[PDB]
Symmetry: C2
Subunit: 223 residues, 2 copies
Amino acid sequence: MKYIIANWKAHKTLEEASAWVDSVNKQISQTPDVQRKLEDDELIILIAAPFPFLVPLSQKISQKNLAVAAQDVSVYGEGAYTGEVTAKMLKGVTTHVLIGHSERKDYFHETDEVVLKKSEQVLSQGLSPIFCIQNESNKIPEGANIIAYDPKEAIGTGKNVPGEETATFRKKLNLFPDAVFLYGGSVNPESIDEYLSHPEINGFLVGGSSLDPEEFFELVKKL
Amino acid sequence: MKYIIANWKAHKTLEEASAWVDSVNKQISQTPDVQRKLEDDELIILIAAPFPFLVPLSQKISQKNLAVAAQDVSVYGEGAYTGEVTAKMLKGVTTHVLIGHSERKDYFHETDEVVLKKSEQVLSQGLSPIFCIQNESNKIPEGANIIAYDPKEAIGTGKNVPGEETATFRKKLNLFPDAVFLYGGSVNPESIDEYLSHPEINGFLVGGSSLDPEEFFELVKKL
């Protein structure tokens, strides 16, 4: 069960986003080994798209284990919180919610308490958090089954964490042995081979190399 | 040119939201005086819906001067800002962007600098900010043509600001004489008559009394 997440971050218009889905759809139908892994639950591809694109894009998708995911969610539930997108609103549109991304720590001063609250919202609606952490000091909820290690220094820098340090890291975390562990941080078609030889690493969170749907599919083809 | 904005805040599922649009659509077609004002640009109805609902709901709408609006927008432009919805992304989906809501000051510590940055993003994409203020101390950009006075003490409390104090307030703001000025804060079908006799007030921002599409249409029928 390999995971790969295209994290567009704050990129793309509705039109650019829909073109991306047509490019990935066509490549999937053109690549029978990828189709096999998807159909056999050996692979899942998550498109972590901005909130306003989740529903239109998900209407363009019929491939099993290809699905949209939210990039974030409100710390609040339903209520008078102008601007907030709640887990309950996502219950309709997606099954996976990325939370705790390093960028939200840097730019919006998200703390562990904040992310843990976001995690409780996601789980209480029956959704799956993809719980991002920056290091060993970030607290991890026990309802979290999918963790993404995305350290700030590796994001967009080319300085990906050595594969064996990444595998070592996973063994040292506050995680059930059967949890899903992803790596994110300058994963590109050259970088990714450094992690595929470590079974402790179950997938990838891909930012930069996810914007071009062809580059992203080079990554998909390697899992 | 009267404005009325249904601010759902952090309410509704996709299904609840779509039902709302069918209820308002049917009432409009059933109310020829409302249809006339809409067609003659005497009235605009803005549905300020959560980000993931903007595109599906706008596909259910063919009535002129009935349109969706965003409740907020990122301080950032396109870039590596996981979770952010930018003005550029909204250029596709909506023409109006609510910014500066009092709830975002209380819960997310938005400051004038923050809201002014959000305003610059909205305008640079050719969209219309609906610029909310809490009092006379909030700075107002000059590119802002639509201002909504939404003081915290009047929100959800029943303590709406007296109509004449509201009209007086508008005359004292840093605003061009031809700017659009809305009032928000416990506007309901009883409250609203207190403001309709003051021509300084060009419309309403409606939170609580907007969730029920029938109550909301009682408000619409009074403009």
